[PDB]
């Protein structure tokens, strides 16, 4: 566990990497938000035509 000082530090860098990955997942979440709202608008106007 004094070796897990450095192993803990590696885990902290890994948690940093995971925080980065989660930030970019939030970015992809907003991406899919705007994207899927566009897709909904597309299907909306299709149904507007079809009715």
């Amino acid at each position: 566990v004094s070796s897990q000082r450095a192993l803990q530090t590696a885990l902290e860098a890994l948690s940093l990497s995971f925080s980065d990955i989660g930030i970019r997942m939030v970015d992809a979440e907003s991406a899919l938000n705007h994207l899927d709202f566009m897709w909904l608008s597309v299907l909306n106007q299709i149904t507007e035509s079809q009715i």
Binding site: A13, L16, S17, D20, R24
Partner: protein, 39 residues
């Protein structure tokens, strides 16, 4: 209508700061620095 002030001193200062702080952060996240390169 009115023509409000558009301070290009602040503008050129910010451009100089961006170009000044472009290649700064070499830490490990670096996609923030990639976005800063985009900016």
């Amino acid at each position: 209508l009115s023509y409000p002030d558009i301070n290009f001193k602040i503008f050129s200062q910010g451009v100089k700061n961006i170009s000044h702080l472009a290649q700064f952060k070499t830490t490990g996240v670096e996609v923030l620095q990639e976005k800063a390169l985009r900016v």
